[PDB]
C-alpha cells in the first residue's frame, strides 16, 4: 500500500486507508 504522505493518483487509492487524495496519501 501507500502512507499517508505518498504519491497515489485519483484511480489508485493505494493508501492502506484509501487516504487518496487524487495524489497525495
Do not use: H
Not at 500500500?1 to 496519501?25: E, I, V
Amino acid at each position: 500500500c501507500k502512507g499517508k504522505g505518498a504519491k497515489c493518483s485519483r484511480l489508485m487509492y493505494d493508501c492502506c486507508t484509501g487516504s487518496c487524495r487524487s495524489g497525495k496519501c
